[PDB]
Amino acid sequence: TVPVALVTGAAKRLGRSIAEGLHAEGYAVCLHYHRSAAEANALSATLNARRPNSAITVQADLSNVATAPAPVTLFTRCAELVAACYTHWGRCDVLVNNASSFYPTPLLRREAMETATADLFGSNAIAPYFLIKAFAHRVAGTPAKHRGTNYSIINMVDAMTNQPLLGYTIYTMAKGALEGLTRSAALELAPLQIRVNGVGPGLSVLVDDMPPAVWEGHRSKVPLYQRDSSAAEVSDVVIFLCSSKAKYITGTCVKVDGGYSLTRA
Amino acid sequence: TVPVALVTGAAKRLGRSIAEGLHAEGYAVCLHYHRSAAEANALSATLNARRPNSAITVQADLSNVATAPVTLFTRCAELVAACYTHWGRCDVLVNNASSFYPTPLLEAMETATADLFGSNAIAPYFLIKAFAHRVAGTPAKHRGTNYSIINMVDAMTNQPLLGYTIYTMAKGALEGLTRSAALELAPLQIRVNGVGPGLSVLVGHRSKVPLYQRDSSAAEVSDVVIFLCSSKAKYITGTCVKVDGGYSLTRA
Amino acid sequence: VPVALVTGAAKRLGRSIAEGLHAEGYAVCLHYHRSAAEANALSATLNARRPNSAITVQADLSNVATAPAPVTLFTRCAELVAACYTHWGRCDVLVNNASSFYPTPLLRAMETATADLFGSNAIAPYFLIKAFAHRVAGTPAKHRGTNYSIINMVDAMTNQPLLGYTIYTMAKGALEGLTRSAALELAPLQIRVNGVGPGLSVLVGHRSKVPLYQRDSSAAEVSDVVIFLCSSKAKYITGTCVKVDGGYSLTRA
Amino acid sequence: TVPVALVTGAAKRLGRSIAEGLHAEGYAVCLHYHRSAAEANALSATLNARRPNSAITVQADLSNVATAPAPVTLFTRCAELVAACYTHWGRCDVLVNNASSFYPTPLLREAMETATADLFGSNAIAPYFLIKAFAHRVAGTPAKHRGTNYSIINMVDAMTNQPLLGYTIYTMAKGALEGLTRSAALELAPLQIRVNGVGPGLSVLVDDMPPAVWEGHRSKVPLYQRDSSAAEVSDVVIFLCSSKAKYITGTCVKVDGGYSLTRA
Ligand SMILES: NC(=O)C1=CN([C@@H]2O[C@H](COP(=O)(O)OP(=O)(O)OC[C@H]3O[C@@H](n4cnc5c(N)ncnc54)[C@H](OP(=O)(O)O)[C@@H]3O)[C@@H](O)[C@H]2O)C=CC1
Ligand SMILES: NC(=O)C1=CN([C@@H]2O[C@H](COP(=O)(O)OP(=O)(O)OC[C@H]3O[C@@H](n4cnc5c(N)ncnc54)[C@H](OP(=O)(O)O)[C@@H]3O)[C@@H](O)[C@H]2O)C=CC1
Ligand SMILES: NC(=O)C1=CN([C@@H]2O[C@H](COP(=O)(O)OP(=O)(O)OC[C@H]3O[C@@H](n4cnc5c(N)ncnc54)[C@H](OP(=O)(O)O)[C@@H]3O)[C@@H](O)[C@H]2O)C=CC1
Ligand SMILES: NC(=O)C1=CN([C@@H]2O[C@H](COP(=O)(O)OP(=O)(O)OC[C@H]3O[C@@H](n4cnc5c(N)ncnc54)[C@H](OP(=O)(O)O)[C@@H]3O)[C@@H](O)[C@H]2O)C=CC1
Ligand SMILES: Nc1nc(=O)c2nc(CNc3ccc(C(=O)N[C@@H](CCC(=O)O)C(=O)O)cc3)cnc2[nH]1
Ligand SMILES: Nc1nc(=O)c2nc(CNc3ccc(C(=O)N[C@@H](CCC(=O)O)C(=O)O)cc3)cnc2[nH]1
Ligand SMILES: Nc1nc(=O)c2nc(CNc3ccc(C(=O)N[C@@H](CCC(=O)O)C(=O)O)cc3)cnc2[nH]1
Ligand SMILES: Nc1nc(=O)c2nc(CNc3ccc(C(=O)N[C@@H](CCC(=O)O)C(=O)O)cc3)cnc2[nH]1
């Protein structure tokens, strides 16, 4: 009783929605955040008000860089994130790799390039690798009698992977590595009954820092409804794949994109 | 309003689990069968004992062959028409009925072509077209709010079962139907998706399944079909969901 | 001198495939349905360059019976492959290129379209591959050729359906399934089976959307790829589809 | 006057066959290497004996680490590889991202961080900085003086959907390399730079194991029941670089004898 979910980047948008949907199914939730301390503490208050000691927050930079209090490597920051679930609640049944940087890295016209690469690949790919390693190590270190009955890892990927967004090469590479992680971890962790799946949004909760015609033009291209998704239209799929009814699904990436990946220029 | 689901090959195995699953969600279900009349009728009796007027059975050969002439198109149209005649609506279509047997490359090949392609591909196309036409012909204020078509595909499509070429071709066509009808029917808010089992309710290779080293139960597949029809899945369309316990991840 | 059977060979990509294969030394069997004049003019051209290097054979590849007991699509397909063995004693390459292509809208006569689009694009390739494979298996091992290749012309844009073309889109997906299934099952006979998928090629606006060059392709930009896949240098390639689309499948709306 | 190709990891096996195959078509080849200096210099001597001034060798660690000086970054090392082509021959027309470390990183059980940097560097990040450096030098060339057939080939993996057990970082990096292939092909199409992939299945399998075990692996390939020769892969790379392939971009060609069609 009281399964525990770890959701990275849980403070806002899709990750907040995922944490809420998991909390609504009875999970205690560990809300990871990087820079959004206010929103993460506000969400924690809301969920703890519904159920005392059902949400906590942990801060971590998931870029592939070392930090300071010897320097602290990304891998041990990820190990410590999983550790916060077992320390507080004695378990971790669900891990959602949701946190993600996303900005252009154009090929056509150096501290920027160096920090872009660690940031985008760490957050979207390498920290997921380390977190899965930490999550799976902990299941392995748990006596079988004490293991949970429904371990589930979700990687937030991208429905539009075969149709790249112009000028976003590092991001697209990182989401491709994340799909590779989904398949590889699914295979390798199957004997522990840890399922690993991907959920791929198309356009979801689209930021509108552009002229109104440009924003409406973007959304209008989604065949189903001619709009971007809501946060829940994505997070409800995450919550299903973690549910026990999804127990035979692993290594699978589910598009939640309104048909947008079906389109062509 | 009680929504209606048409499930083909509903009498046994996955199709029965899909009919039972939608019925537990509150659907009235049209149970299509070909030869399993006794089984279909017994399933209908069970579901109607639970909720009166919640199940009917209809029979039809979904092979691509003229019947006694009645064409496959006409038989598929009448199947959708059965739902509208009995309940005035059809909200969900599950294209589950499917013949499966070898057509090795190295009149019985023409019977196999019409049977394997009809059930797995050509009948689903007519059924989808009939479902779409009835929705379009319905005044927009009287339309339902959660239209959903599920095609039962094959998670192992990229890894062909040796000797099953026509079956594999037909399931590849059904994936093409999924994508094309999802695109074209999006303006009517009809979602079109696939669910692809791996090894399920085998009647060996099951020890090779990475997750649990067994074929799936019926519910482990039908529970997914039910979710994709749920309104929580209403932004998913044009997508095929593998339910294979990772079997498609394997190699020889 | 090896032999290629090319369906729908009279014009456009099929004619360029036949020309490309012929230029590598192949004798070519030029299949046609309605374009008898174009097929026979092409045959005249290739035979003038190399005597007895081309023939032509007519067949409706729709999944329908034709009159002389009615003749089924299966039989007409068997007779296309037999035409190569009768005339030249071999058939080393089969290019499944013939294809009907027109709308079959789901929204806003259909038995004919089903038989025609699914026949040419999927069921006839299935029957032709079976006939082609039977003839190789029936050939004594010492007398088989050393480079059997089957090429199915598919569609680069298959994951991105063209609005209103459901039957065509379904048929090309069946054809990709046939490519994978036939490649696995015919591998012991060393018969390779691959696909080539154009995007927009030799169109009769949308051109500007192609990332590479902002144009549809020429016929040779496709047929050269077919020709390489049939070459001995490509002998380890089977069961795979090669996109030749200028990057169009990378685009989104 | 003579087109120039930069082949990473050119000293042995597939990279050497790719170098030989492009050289046979008339390319001058820059042969990159990391540890195999003897093998690289032997190959360059062979190519130069066949055709004077048709090969050079360059060393670089393509791991995502800083190297010995102010430290030298991976990007800098990557730009200097491409610049070596322009310094010596004035041009760089083809890039083959072939260099690749390959060993397990099991999920269950400094050498952790160096393996990530090495597997992710060789297979994904160094490809990226090499593609950018290559693209930058083309963009900087006046259109009057640009080459007419720019081609980038990424060596991917036909078995990407069917992961090798215990090889998670490798599998991830190749998945990233496929993303690079698609993204670079779209962004560099305006400069007529094509970007494609070639994915071997089992090629030139090392036989440092029991014979029965090596024959057992090989026998799983449906076509010929063997791993491929080096030329059976490199000939495809050379075709994709040819002008006959000039409408192909953004595409990954499996050269796997049907292995990806198999299941357990
Ligand atoms: N929304 C969409 O349209 C699409 C989304 N996706 C994927 O879905 C997931 C969520 O989408 P969305 O909710 O829009 O994602 P956001 O862009 O809102 O970012 C989510 C969180 O990622 C965290 N984050 C970013 N960089 C780092 C870092 N270097 N270290 C640690 N945390 C970091 C931030 O946490 P903080 O605020 O605490 O700094 C941010 O709140 C992502 O994986 C995204 O890639 C994929 C395709 C489309
Ligand atoms: N079970 C598995 O492991 C897998 C299943 N699938 C797919 O999932 C779906 C169901 O799986 P399963 O339950 O095993 O399927 P079955 O093989 O049990 O067949 C299901 C039903 O199809 C109907 N059917 C067959 N041919 C025709 C026809 N010509 N006309 C009309 N109805 C016909 C039969 O109805 P009747 O009995 O009334 O004649 C049969 O009961 C199918 O689409 C199948 O391809 C895909 C991959 C794996
Ligand atoms: N061109 C493009 O942009 C694209 C092409 N493709 C594929 O490339 C291949 C060739 O393309 P293209 O050259 O444009 O094809 P065409 O549309 O020109 O059709 C080629 C030939 O197919 C034959 N054909 C049509 N219906 C039948 C039938 N029922 N029975 C027998 N033969 C028939 C016709 O032969 P006749 O004239 O003798 O009647 C026609 O000349 C096709 O398979 C096509 O699907 C795929 C994607 C894009
Ligand atoms: N062979 C196969 O069966 C398959 C191969 N592939 C891909 O094809 C390509 C070639 O295959 P193969 O020839 O087997 O590859 P190899 O394993 O023989 O490695 C080729 C070269 O990579 C170079 N390399 C490795 N790590 C680094 C590094 N950190 N920095 C710089 N150079 C490095 C080495 O150069 P040096 O020796 O000079 O140090 C090595 O000779 C690779 O990309 C591989 O992933 C994909 C699937 C199957
Ligand atoms: N981490 C993450 N966060 C996101 O918000 C996100 N969004 C998408 C959805 N795709 C897009 C595409 C374009 C723009 C956008 O705002 N474009 C601006 C500037 C950048 C551009 O050139 O596209 C525009 O004006 O077009 C946003 C989201 C995909 N992955 C993500 N990943
Ligand atoms: N329509 C359909 N029915 C199924 O039962 C089915 N099963 C699978 C799962 N794959 C397989 C693969 C091999 C065998 C098999 O070995 N069959 C036995 C007899 C059972 C049979 O063929 O139905 C055999 O003797 O070959 C069964 C299922 C995939 N698609 C299906 N499709
Ligand atoms: N068998 C086959 N033949 C083809 O020509 C073909 N072409 C494509 C390329 N895609 C397309 C998409 C749209 C139109 C189209 O709508 N044609 C216009 C042309 C009218 C004009 O000349 O302006 C039309 O409406 O007829 C053609 C090709 C794909 N598969 C094919 N398959
Ligand atoms: N860079 C690279 N080099 C390769 O040789 C290579 N080979 C493959 C072909 N796949 C495989 C699969 C398994 C084994 C294997 O069994 N190796 C042993 C150790 C032997 C060794 O790699 O030196 C193993 O323990 O996995 C080798 C190659 C795929 N990618 C590659 N990538």
XYZ file of C-alpha atoms in Angstrom, chain B residues 103 105 117 153-176 179 240 242 248, chain C residues 96 121-122 125-126 129 150-155 158-159 169-188 191-196 237-242, chain D residues 158 161-162 222-223 254 256-263:
91
model
C 0.185 -19.229 -47.240
C 5.717 -19.178 -50.889
C -7.295 -10.210 -46.977
C -3.015 -5.430 -35.737
C 0.195 -7.421 -35.119
C 3.020 -6.231 -32.885
C 5.395 -8.523 -34.804
C 4.731 -6.908 -38.195
C 8.389 -6.061 -38.841
C 9.411 -9.641 -37.931
C 7.312 -11.831 -40.227
C 6.106 -15.238 -39.155
C 7.659 -17.622 -41.670
C 5.076 -18.906 -44.139
C 2.298 -16.419 -43.344
C 2.793 -13.953 -46.189
C -0.850 -13.093 -46.985
C -1.687 -12.700 -43.292
C 1.321 -10.418 -42.868
C 0.409 -8.385 -45.947
C -3.158 -8.007 -44.720
C -2.093 -6.752 -41.300
C 0.262 -4.339 -43.020
C -2.696 -3.058 -45.024
C -4.722 -2.707 -41.823
C -1.991 -0.500 -40.344
C -2.204 1.617 -43.485
C -3.240 5.836 -40.458
C -0.691 1.524 -32.999
C 2.024 -2.937 -29.090
C 9.187 -7.387 -30.801
C 6.906 -4.938 -59.077
C -0.221 -2.919 -55.917
C -0.330 -5.965 -53.650
C 3.118 -8.737 -56.672
C 2.329 -11.576 -54.269
C 6.830 -13.369 -56.396
C 13.021 -8.676 -56.385
C 12.170 -4.973 -56.101
C 8.787 -3.746 -54.871
C 8.067 -0.103 -55.632
C 6.562 1.252 -52.414
C 5.878 4.779 -51.092
C 3.442 5.667 -46.214
C 3.455 6.878 -42.580
C -2.268 3.533 -48.950
C -3.462 0.149 -47.647
C -2.131 -1.618 -50.720
C 1.349 -0.091 -50.372
C 1.419 -1.186 -46.728
C 0.575 -4.722 -47.850
C 3.401 -4.457 -50.369
C 5.867 -3.481 -47.640
C 4.619 -6.486 -45.676
C 5.218 -8.693 -48.724
C 8.744 -7.297 -49.003
C 9.603 -8.328 -45.433
C 7.816 -11.684 -45.562
C 9.206 -12.698 -48.943
C 12.727 -11.623 -47.977
C 12.703 -13.856 -44.903
C 11.163 -16.864 -46.652
C 13.149 -16.697 -49.918
C 16.518 -16.062 -48.249
C 17.451 -19.805 -48.429
C 16.526 -14.364 -53.612
C 16.764 -10.838 -52.217
C 13.570 -8.813 -51.767
C 13.676 -5.052 -51.221
C 11.565 -1.953 -51.631
C 12.229 1.434 -53.203
C 20.680 -6.166 -48.593
C 17.311 -7.864 -48.206
C 14.006 -7.158 -46.495
C 14.484 -3.444 -46.559
C 12.933 -0.401 -48.128
C 14.993 2.477 -49.458
C 20.155 -2.120 -38.424
C 14.555 -1.715 -32.630
C 15.961 -4.999 -31.238
C 18.563 -15.375 -42.792
C 20.521 -14.463 -45.958
C 19.839 -1.496 -43.575
C 21.789 -6.776 -42.521
C 20.965 -9.875 -44.598
C 17.475 -9.815 -43.110
C 18.645 -10.156 -39.497
C 16.261 -7.417 -38.330
C 13.396 -9.556 -39.642
C 14.102 -12.247 -37.037
C 12.579 -12.839 -33.605
